[PDB]
Amino acid sequence: NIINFDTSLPTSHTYLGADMEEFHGRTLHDDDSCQVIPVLPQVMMILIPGQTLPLQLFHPQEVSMVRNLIQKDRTFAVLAYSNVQEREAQFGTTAEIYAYREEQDFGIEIVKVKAIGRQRFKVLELRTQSDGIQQAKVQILPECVLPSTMSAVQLESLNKCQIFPSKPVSREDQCSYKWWQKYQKRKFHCANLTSWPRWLYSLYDAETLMDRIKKQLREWDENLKDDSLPSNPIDFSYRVAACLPIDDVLRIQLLKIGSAIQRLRCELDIMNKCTSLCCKQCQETEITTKNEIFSLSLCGPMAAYVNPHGYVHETLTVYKACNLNLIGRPSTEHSWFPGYAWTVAQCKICASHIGWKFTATKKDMSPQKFWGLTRSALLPT
């Protein structure tokens, strides 16, 4: 069930251009501070820190705004719209600019830009400017970090029994069910002084939760061991939150969580207890099989891609998807996967635009076996 395809082209965003003006990221807010940051409208997507956003610029005012930001601090504020529309939002994310091209072609303004989130904030007020680009109130939300759960009750004598040797090899049977048992027995050895068992303290351990999430990620599809998965729990939590196929309310709830351990526990509960996906209109869909969700990119099963005209669709790549119909021919001028050809995949019952079918173009790949969905009408149940 493996095809000879490199999982780095969709992440590279080569369908925009090739001679991308790479800009080095050297910015950071001072933490816990009042700030004012401009907001680009006409975007409806919750952005998680660390996730890459591909944006298209058409209107002259927003192009002027992004040019001014380029000749300024290269950070705007991506707003996190709630269920109620009309700018009924309370949270957001600061996105840093690291790529910019013009590519006039038709040539009105036309701007190619890619942004990645860096920090979270809670907006206090939403001020609207007469120019058309609004600047909102920004309060930087610090990312809480917690020490080991046993440092409070730890014994001073047996503190030398706290530096474990490196994990032997990786991903081997009886080489993990025993090493993890040893690690649990030796790390939470002071759980006898408290009133709770060792496994309860291991439920709140960062490393154990990351290992469990890694095992689940391998269960979804083959992961290349330490395949760009960060060691720091904050970054791992943000990557997992970016790659989870969940609706808007779940993502904003994940964003509201301020600690790495709570975020990891919530993500693990989400991927362990949610299996059913719905077709919004329709009662259900064949996409209910979560076990066939592939990930043909380094970023994970989901990434953000922009169409020729402004709008941005984040997609989910799955192995199989029934209850769909095909309209149109397999066009290939703007497929988000360079070695693939895209086709319009329409729903079979409610006929709501969700998914794109892909057809064979080369030899060493999967012929007529591909699906790329969207959050347009997919909800988890």
Partner: peptide, 29 residues
């Protein structure tokens, strides 16, 4: 042909106008 009809919200392509209008009203609401 060149078929200038093209859906902007979704990106669906049509050689006529009836299906494009149907898809526009589908996007609406």
């Amino acid at each position: 042909g060149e078929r200038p009809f093209q859906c902007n919200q979704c990106g669906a392509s049509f050689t006529q106008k009836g299906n494009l209008l149907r898809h526009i009203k589908l996007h609406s609401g």
